[PDB]
Design a protein around this nucleic acid. Structure first.
Ligand code: NA
Lengths: 15, 396
RNA sequence: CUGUGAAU
């Protein structure tokens, strides 16, 4: 299991 | 420590002693601070007492200020003080008024000092519970109104005094505590404390559970505290202790309007990040478990189609959470919710419309990812539980 | 036991 936080770019609801 | 007249030939306290001999000797203060002597007095005051025996106990235990404080702050004497206070409140003689009045003046003058003491705070808690409400409120009026109230809320001992006030005292007399904690400079420093968060939660629980004026008082105090919590819920949800406050609000149906505000303005568009937090992941779970179905659908849609996959590996938000030390519990929560709804253990109808097909669609997406990564998931206990969860559902 | 909270 990973311990570091990984981010992904958010997608708007209308996109 | 014990007087020599009370000792046998070996130096130990004489067995079978009369309570009257201790009362008439003037050496009660030695017995009350001794383990053996105070055990004797505790059992003695449990039996029947004459009129003058009660008066002797009232004068020697709760009658003199310096002796009262010395016994209240003693590891053993605090039990005798509480017993004598109970006997004093149960004896409705002519001196009843002056006794409780003097008891009130003793506690009020040293309120904060007794609240912060490991043993004297028990005397205050037992007083608040058993005294006349008019006299117990005067103890509440002796609580500090300034920054010293922070010390009382976050102290290991004094925090239980506040919670006792919240439980037995009318809100009108302790509304100032709600205003104090709801202040921005006080909310985060008290909610983020081990003992202060217990104070805040107890306040929320009491304000949630008479006249329209009393209801208006309860609603306006809860509104003020909820506004402050929602204004800082991002910092509170990620906090080691304050996360329990956000969870309790989200999990309480009587606070629905505030739950949706926390979900709408704090958790949405931050689900992937908050799911990988040690403390906020518990908040995300509670949000998934208690959000209205309309907001639950938006939370599901954010995890499934709300993030651009990694341009190199192609892994999306579900992949990251599924293999994170804390995010994996959020994925297990989503799967359990969908399996419960499909198998008839969770509510799927709202507004007279069955949303079971939405849970089926989310279940398909979760089931297909577990299938695609079953090789890696079968090596984790969290992956094994997801595989077992889907196996039970396909047994049916 | 893959992950957090009260004083005799
Ligand atoms: Na667990």
């Amino acid at each position: 299991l990973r311990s570091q936080k990984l981010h992904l770019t958010y997608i708007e609801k209308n996109k | 420590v014990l007087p020599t007249w009370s000792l046998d030939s070996n130096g130990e306290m004489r067995s079978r002693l009369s309570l009257s001999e201790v009362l008439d000797s003037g050496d009660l203060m030695k017995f009350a601070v001794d383990k053996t002597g105070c055990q004797f007095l505790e059992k003695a005051v449990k039996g029947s007492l004459t009129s003058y025996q009660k008066f002797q106990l009232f004068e020697q235990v709760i009658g003199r200020k310096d002796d009262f404080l010395k016994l209240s702050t003693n590891i053993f004497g605090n039990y005798l003080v509480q017993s004598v206070i109970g006997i004093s409140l149960a004896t409705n003689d002519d001196g009843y008024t002056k006794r409780q009045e003097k008891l009130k003046n003793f506690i009020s003058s040293q309120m904060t000092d007794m609240c912060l003491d490991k043993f004297a705070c028990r005397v205050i808690q037992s007083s608040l519970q058993n005294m006349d409400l008019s006299l117990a409120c005067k103890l509440v009026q002796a609580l500090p109104r300034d920054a010293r109230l922070i010390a009382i809320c976050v102290d290991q001992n004094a925090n239980h005094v506040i919670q006792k006030v919240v439980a037995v005292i009318p809100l009108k007399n302790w509304e100032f505590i709600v205003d104090f904690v709801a202040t921005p400079e006080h909310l985060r420093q008290i909610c983020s404390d081990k003992y202060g968060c217990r104070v805040v939660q107890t306040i929320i629980e009491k304000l949630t559970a008479l006249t329209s004026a009393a209801q208006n008082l309860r609603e306006r105090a809860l509104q003020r505290l909820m506004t402050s919590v929602t204004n800082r819920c991002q910092e509170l949800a990620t906090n080691e202790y304050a996360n329990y406050i956000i969870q309790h609000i989200v999990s309480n149906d009587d606070l629905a309007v505030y739950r949706e505000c926390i979900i709408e303005k704090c958790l949405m568009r931050n689900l992937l990040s908050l799911s990988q937090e040690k403390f906020a992941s518990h908040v995300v779970e509670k949000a998934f478990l208690h959000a209205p179905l309309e907001l639950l659908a938006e939370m599901m849609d954010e995890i499934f189609d709300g993030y651009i996959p990694h341009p190199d590996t192609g892994k999306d938000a579900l992949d990251i959470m599924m293999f994170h030390q804390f995010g994996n519990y959020v994925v297990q929560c989503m799967l359990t919710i969908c399996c419960d709804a499909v198998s008839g253990r969770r509510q799927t109808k709202e507004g007279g419309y069955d949303h079971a097909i939405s849970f089926q669609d989310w279940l398909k997406k979760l089931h297909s990812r577990v299938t695609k990564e079953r090789h890696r998931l079968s090596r984790f206990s969290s992956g094994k539980k997801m595989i077992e969860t889907l196996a039970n559902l396909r047994s049916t």
